[PDB]
Amino acid sequence: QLTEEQIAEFKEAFSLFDKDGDGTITTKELGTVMRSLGQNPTEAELQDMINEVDADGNGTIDFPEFLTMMARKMKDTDSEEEIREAFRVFDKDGNGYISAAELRHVMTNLGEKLTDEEVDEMIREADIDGDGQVNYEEFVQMMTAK
C-alpha cells in the first residue's frame, strides 16, 4: 500500500518544516514557512495548528503527528473539491446560483424522476438567503450537514 517513494516525500516535507533537524516542527519553524509563502498567521493560530495533532501533548509535532496533519489536510481538500465539483455540475450556467430549472434538469438527467414540487422543495430547503436560488455557500452548508 505505502511506497518508499511516498515515505521519501513524507520525509522531505517534514524536513522542509524541521529546518534545524531536531526531529520536531516547532511553531517558529511552522510560522516561518507560512510566512515565506505570503499568508501571515499569529502564534495563536500556530498553536491551534500544533494542538489539533499534538497526540503526546509535548507542544510540538513529531513525525507520526505530521503524518496525521498531512492526512487530514488531504482529506479536507478532497471533500472540499468533491463539493466544488458537484456544485459546478448543478450550476449549469456558471452564474454561481443553482436555479430550479437547473436542479430539475440535472436530476432527471441522473434518472431521478422528481416532480416539480420535489425540486422546489430541494431548492427551498437549501436556500438560506431566500432568493429562490442556491449559491455556493448554501450548497456547501447542505453538502456537509449532519
Partner: peptide, 24 residues
C-alpha cells in the same frame, strides 16, 4: 541525467506540494 536523481527532483516537487497543502 540519471533517474535515481531526477526522480529526486520529482520528489522535491512532491514534498513542496505537500507543504503548500499544509500551509493551506
Amino acid at each position: 541525467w540519471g533517474q535515481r536523481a531526477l526522480q529526486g527532483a520529482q520528489a522535491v516537487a512532491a514534498a513542496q506540494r505537500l507543504v503548500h497543502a499544509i500551509a493551506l
